[PDB]
Specification:
The protein is about 10% helix and about 50% strand. It is mainly beta. It has one domain: Jelly Rolls (Sandwich). It has a seven-stranded antiparallel β-sheet. It binds calcium ion. One of its GO terms (molecular function) is metal ion binding.
Length: about 230
């Protein structure tokens, strides 16, 4: 199936990282932050992703959205990226889906820099605390199915046949984003590398971390959005 127009045309999503464009063909999206190298003032790395445009943003509890895709990940050992997330008005996050090869405990692998990436989700509950849940593991080159649903405040994520969801902290100007947001972080110590707003600092970080590859390919993509 071809990538929906809401994404390709910009009717719903704004692009972050113009070059190269993620649409490599009518049916494929390729996110390569090491090439797009898009930065934001508070970002901690490089990204290549789409975000629901500002004018359409409403509260999490005021929208029904469903994002689904076949996701292939090719990345160097030790890499860590966020491939989908619900962002809040300020600097807050509501939901985040990761593919990371770090030593953070609590997942199926949790062994830094060994080529086996943990795929998990972090959801911020109504008390403002994040609850994390392991979905599966994968090695570079593998593919999995991702489905994220925000049912008017109740967010659910499914991957590898595993599902987890809870009602989340509401935000009046929330917005969904997806793609490849590569995190500048040491996989062993989890310490952040680089300086905010300094692209060259992140360039050096990824070089020193040995992250020379990070490509998230998405196919069979679908996105539904109903705001009331
Ligand atoms: Ca690992």
């Amino acid at each position: 199936s071809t990538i929906p127009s809401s994404i390709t045309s910009g009717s719903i999503f704004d692009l972050e990282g113009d070059n190269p464009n993620p649409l490599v063909d009518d049916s494929t999206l390729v996110f390569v932050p090491l090439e797009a190298q898009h930065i934001t003032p508070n970002g901690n790395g490089w990204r290549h992703e789409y975000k629901v445009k500002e004018s359409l943003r409403v509260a999490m509890t005021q929208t029904y959205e469903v994002f689904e895709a076949t996701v292939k990940v090719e990345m160097s050992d030790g890499g860590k990226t966020i491939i989908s997330q619900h962002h809040a008005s300020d600097t807050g996050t509501i939901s985040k889906v990761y593919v990371s090869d770090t030593d953070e405990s609590g997942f199926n692998d949790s062994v830094a820099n060994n080529g086996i990436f943990d795929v998990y989700v972090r959801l911020r509950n109504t008390s403002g605390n994040e609850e994390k849940f392991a979905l599966g593991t994968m090695t570079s080159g593998e593919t999995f199915n991702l489905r994220v649903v925000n049912n008017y405040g109740d967010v659910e994520v499914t991957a590898f046949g595993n599902s987890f969801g809870i009602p989340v902290e509401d935000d009046s100007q929330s917005y969904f984003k997806f793609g490849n947001y590569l995190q500048s972080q040491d996989p062993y110590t989890l310490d952040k590398c680089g300086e905010a707003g300094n692209s060259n600092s992140f360039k050096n970080c990824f070089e020193d971390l040995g992250i020379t590859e990070s490509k998230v390919t998405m196919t069979n993509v679908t996105y539904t959005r109903e705001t009331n």
